[PDB]
Amino acid sequence: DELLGQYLDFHYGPGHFDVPNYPKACIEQALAHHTGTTGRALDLGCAVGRSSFELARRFDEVIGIDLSRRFIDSATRLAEQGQLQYQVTLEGELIERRTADLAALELSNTAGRTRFQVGDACALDDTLGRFDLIFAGNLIDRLPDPAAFLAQLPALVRPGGLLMITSPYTLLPEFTPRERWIGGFERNGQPVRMLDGLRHHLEPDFVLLEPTRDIPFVIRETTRKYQHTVAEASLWRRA
Fold first, then answer.
1. Annotated binding residues for S-adenosyl-L-methionine
2. Binding of S-adenosyl-L-methionine: at which residues (predicted)?
3. What is the crossing angle of helices 22-33 and 2-12, to 10°?
C-alpha cells in the first residue's frame, strides 16, 4: 500500500527536482537505439506499468511482468479503465488522494497493446517466446539470483533486437545473497564492477553499445523526503 502510492507517483506523477519521468526517459533511450522490428517487447519488473505503456506507443504487443500482484492489478486497471486513484503520504498519517491518468499522458490510445502478468524474472515461463526488445529497469540489484535471470536473456531476444538494463547497483544481502553477487567486490586485487559482471554473463551473445549512460530518478516518500539516484543504463544488441 505505502510502496504502491510511492510507485504510482514515480510512474505517473509530476516530476520532482526538475528530474524527467524515469520510465519515460528510459524508454526514450531504448527507442533511440532500437534498430530492429517493432512486433513484441517485454518489460521485466514492470511495477505499475509506465514503461510498458510507453513501449506500447511503438510496439504491436508489450508484455509486462512483475512479482507483485498489487502492482500488476494496478497496471491492468490503468489499461482497462484509463485512470486510477491512490493515496500519497504528506506527513505522518496526513495523506492526499491523487489520480493517474493515461489519457493525460497520451498513453490511452495504445493501452490495449499491453498485457500484464505476475511472474518471476529469475524463472520465466518457457512459453514466453522471443522479443524484439526487453527492458529491465531498476531490477538486477533486487533479484535473488541475478545469474539465473541473465541466463535466460540470449534466448529471449531475437538476433538484431535490443536489451536495456538500468540499475543504481545497490547491492544488499536482503535482496541478493553475497555469494550470488555478479559484481561489487574485488577478485584477485582487481575490482569487479556490476557492469563487468553483466559483460561476463551477456557477451558475446550480446554486444554492449558503448558508452553506458547515466539516467537519474526521484522517488517521493513524503512531501519532504525523496530518494534521488543515478542509475546506469546499459544497452545491448543481440548478435
1. 11, 66, 120-121
2. 11, 66, 120-121
3. 50
Annotated binding site for S-adenosyl-L-homocysteine: 11, 66, 120-121
DSSP 84-139: EEEEEEEETTEEEEEEEETGGGT-STTGGGEEEEE--TTS--TT---EEEEEEES-
Annotated binding site: 11, 66, 120-121
Q: How far is CA 233 from CA 6, 54, 137, 198, in A?
A: 22, 17, 9, 12
Task: State the CB neighbour count (10 A cutoff) for residue 17.
Answer: 8
Instruction: Show Cβ contacts of residue 36 under 8 Å, excluding neighbours closer than 6 positions.
Output: 132, 133, 158, 160, 161, 162
Q: What is the resolution of this structure in A?
A: 1.5
**Phi, psi of 114, rounded to the nearest 5 degrees:** -95, 155
Q: Which domain holds residue 118?
A: 2-238
Report the CATH number that the domain containing residue 88 is assigned in CATH.
3.40.50.150
200-211: b or e for each residue (b if 16 or more CB lie within 10 Å)? ebbeeebebeee
Structural determination approach: X-ray
d(CA 110, CA 126): 27
Cis peptide before 211 (omega within 30 of 0): yes
Count of beta carbons in the 10 Å neighbourhood of residue 113: 18
